[PDB]
Design a protein around this ligand. Structure first.
Ligand SMILES: COCc1cc(C(N)=O)no1
Ligand SMILES: [Zn+2]
Length: 140
C-alpha cells in the first residue's frame, strides 16, 4: 500500500483505489495502474520533473529502502499477478529488486522528488508507475 500526496491530489495504484477515491476522482488510467483523487488537506510530496534513472524505493515486504537504477518509462509486458492478468502496462519503469503485491504504492524518489510508485513485481524485478509526465499534479 501507499500513495503520493502532492497538493490536493492523492495518487494511488488504480487497483488499490477505494470507493472514496472513485467518488472524488480526478483522473485514472488502467494501462498505467494509476488513479488520482482529491484531498481536503494539502500533502507533503514534490513530484520529480526530470529523466533520472537512479533513485531509492521503499519495499514494505523488507521494511527497507533500496537504491536502484531503473529503465525509462515504457510499454512493458507484465506477467500475471494476484491483482492483474498478464497484460501490457504503459509508463512502467523496471529495476532489479524485490517486489511483492503488497509493496505496491511504495515511493521511488530521486534528487528531484517522487518519480513513481511500485506497481509490479516478480522474477527479481520491481516495476514503478511513472508520474513525472503528469505535469498537472503541480497545480490546481
Ligand atoms: C471540499 O472537499 C472536497 C473533497 C472531498 C475529498 C475526499 N473526500 O476525498 N477530497 O476533496
Ligand atoms: Zn530526478
Amino acid at each position: 500500500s501507499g500513495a503520493i500526496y502532492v497538493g490536493n491530489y492523492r495518487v494511488v495504484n488504480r487497483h488499490l483505489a477505494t470507493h472514496n477515491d472513485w467518488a472524488n476522482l480526478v483522473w485514472e488510467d488502467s494501462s498505467r495502474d494509476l488513479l488520482v483523487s482529491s484531498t481536503t488537506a494539502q500533502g507533503c510530496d514534490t513530484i520529480a520533473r526530470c529523466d533520472c534513472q537512479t533513485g531509492v524505493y521503499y519495499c514494505s515486504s523488507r521494511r527497507k529502502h533500496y537504491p536502484v537504477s531503473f529503465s525509462k518509462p515504457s510499454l512493458i509486458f507484465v506477467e500475471a499477478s494476484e491483482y492483474y492478468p498478464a497484460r501490457y502496462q504503459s509508463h512502467l519503469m523496471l529495476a532489479v529488486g524485490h517486489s511483492e503485491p503488497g509493496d505496491c504504492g511504495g515511493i521511488l524518489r530521486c534528487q528531484h522528488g517522487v518519480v513513481g510508485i511500485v506497481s509490479t513485481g516478480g522474477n527479481g524485478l520491481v516495476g514503478f508507475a511513472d508520474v513525472r509526465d503528469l505535469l498537472w499534479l503541480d497545480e490546481e
